[PDB]
Ligand binder design. Structure first.
Ligand SMILES: NCCNc1cc(-c2ccnc(Nc3cccc(Cl)c3)n2)ccn1
Ligand SMILES: [Ca+2]
Length: 447
């Protein structure tokens, strides 16, 4: 079997996916850039056997559609699966919609026509997504209007979904009811697209709640309404397509193919701006991103504390003199031992570790000072994301967030109401600043 590291080298971390981290890699010969999703075998269980996974991979490598991410290669070692595909720099669909000033049904129809084209094509080839959500809709290029590429098509069938809340943020809104009860088919992707279409034209999820379970209850009942002021300026054909896409019984629900032939798609692809919808998508995107940043900040604080004591124990055993000092070569041997114990970090090969240790050695010799800098390079990346997400959420630049906004944020993060309210009283008038918010998250993860 071919080795991944011998062909590719890690350049930069693009982001965190559903089943693992996504790394920007470069071919060592041709120089071609690629986005590699690294799935850890220990953190992700396989729903299918080895031969069923290789057959789907082989089929996915031969598929080609302008609204589907291209899977180029597939590698596997003792503890990881590497899914190598094309790179896209346009960002997530909803991040582009919150930046523009005007957004109409013509833009919404042009978006959904692309999503339905990719889905129709993948359904004809017997591939189901199941976890279709705005985060999986990436724009091919950095433009106001760009080509949409759907990511992670077919992975759900072969990999078990994470139970960790940091990986489940913004999934409950889009999941089809039949997926929750076990019996589902490709029609679950039409439902998910119907939910995204509902959010594009109103900025509010059709099935909403104060927490993950309340949302899943609404989805399971399957009842929703077009009873919000913003729906008065939307066409009846757009409402008709949503009704056909959000039909409870999958056999009665419209197909992805028939959804392209619908009057709304045919009329609006061949109109007033929805201002209320843009404001609500801005608020929605800002709320989802602060909740994720909060969960990733708490996770990074626990991860750094685990690695701080582990790396201190590794350096203490290597220190023979007991003076507390080590050589540059010894620090590398200890850092390589940390990845040898917890597994390869998504730090692909030994060359990335020597440079990562050199970057710390240049900044910071006592190994106590090296431990602080080495570990702060991981925490300050998540803390900068937290402050940036807080600043973005704080759209009126008041410097604070209300108690109602905290309840909404902690609701999306799935932190019980009595737990955060108690933690606020320990640190701190119905509102908190960034430092107070950060202090609440630290107290919510044993600090
Ligand atoms: N079908 C192969 C699945 N691999 C895959 C590829 C990508 C993937 C594909 C293209 N670009 C980027 N960059 C990126 C990553 C996170 C956030 C943002 Cl806004 C961009 N990731 C994301 C998730 N999974
Ligand atoms: Ca504010």
């Amino acid at each position: 079997t071919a080795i991944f590291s011998d062909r590719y080298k890690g350049q930069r971390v693009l982001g965190k996916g559903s089943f693992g981290e996504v790394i920007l890699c470069k071919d060592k010969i041709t120089g071609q850039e690629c986005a590699v999703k690294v799935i850890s075998k220990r953190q992700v269980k396989q729903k299918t056997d080895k031969e069923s996974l290789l057959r789907e991979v082989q089929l996915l490598k031969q598929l080609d559609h302008p609204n589907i991410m291209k899977l180029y290669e597939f590698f596997e070692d003792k503890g990881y699966f590497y899914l190598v595909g094309e790179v896209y720099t346009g960002g997530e669909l909803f991040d582009e919609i919150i930046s523009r000033k005007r957004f109409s049904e013509v833009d919404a129809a042009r978006i959904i026509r692309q999503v339905l084209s990719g889905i129709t094509y993948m359904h004809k080839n017997k591939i189901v997504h199941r976890d279709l959500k705005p985060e999986n809709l990436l724009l091919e290029s950095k433009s106001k209007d760009a080509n949409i590429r759907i990511i992670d098509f077919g992975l759900s069938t072969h990999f078990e979904a994470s139970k960790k809340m940091k990986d489940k943020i913004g999934t409950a809104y889009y999941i089809a009811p039949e997926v929750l009860h076990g019996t589902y088919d490709e029609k679950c992707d039409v439902w998910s697209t119907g939910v995204i279409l509902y959010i594009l034209l109103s900025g509010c999820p059709p099935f909403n709640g104060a927490n993950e379970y309340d949302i899943l209850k609404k989805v399971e009942k399957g009842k929703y309404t077009f009873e919000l002021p913003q729906w008065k300026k939307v066409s009846e054909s757009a409402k008709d397509l949503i009704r056909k896409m959000l039909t409870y019984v999958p056999s009665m629900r419209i197909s992805a193919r028939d959804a392209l032939d619908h009057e709304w798609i045919q009329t609006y692809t061949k109109v007033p701006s929805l201002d209320n919808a843009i404001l609500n998508i801005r608020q929605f995107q800002g709320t989802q991103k602060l909740a994720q940043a909060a969960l990733l900040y708490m996770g990074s604080k626990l991860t750094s504390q685990d690695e701080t004591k582990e790396l201190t124990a590794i350096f203490h055993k290597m220190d023979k003199n007991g003076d507390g000092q080590l050589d540059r070569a010894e620090l590398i041997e200890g850092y390589k031992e940390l990845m040898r114990m917890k597994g390869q970090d998504a730090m692909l090969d030994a060359s990335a570790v020597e440079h990562e240790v050199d970057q710390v050695l240049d900044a910071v010799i006592e190994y106590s000072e090296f431990v602080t800098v080495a570990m702060d390079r991981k925490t300050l990346l998540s803390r900068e994301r937290l402050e940036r997400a807080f600043r973005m959420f704080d759209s009126d630049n008041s410097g604070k967030i209300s108690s109602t906004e905290l309840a909404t944020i902690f609701g999306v993060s799935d932190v019980d109401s009595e737990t955060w309210k108690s933690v606020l009283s320990e640190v701190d008038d119905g509102e908190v600043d960034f430092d107070e918010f950060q202090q609440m998250l630290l107290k919510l993860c044993g600090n």
